[PDB]
Amino acid sequence: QXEXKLXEXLXKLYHXEXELXRXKXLLXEX
Numbered sequence: 082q083x084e085x086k087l088x089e090x091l092x093k094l095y096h097x098e099x100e101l102x103r104x105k106x107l108l109x110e111x
C-alpha cells in the first residue's frame with residue numbers, strides 16, 4: 082500500500098477538485 086497510498090494521495094486530491102464542485106455549488110445557488 083506505495084502505489085495504495087500514492088491511490089488514496091491522488092483519492093484525496095481529485096475529493097480537492099469535489100470540494101472546489103461544491104466552490105463553483107455555492108457560487109450555482111449566485
Ligand SMILES: CCCCCCCCCCCCCCCC[N+](C)(C)C
Nearest residue numbers: 083084085087088091092094095098
Ligand atoms: C478527475 C479524477 C481523476 C482521478 C486521478 C487518480 C488516478 C491515479 C492514477 C494512478 C497512477 C499510477 C502510476 C503508477 C505508480 C507506480 N508506483 C506507485 C509503483 C511507483
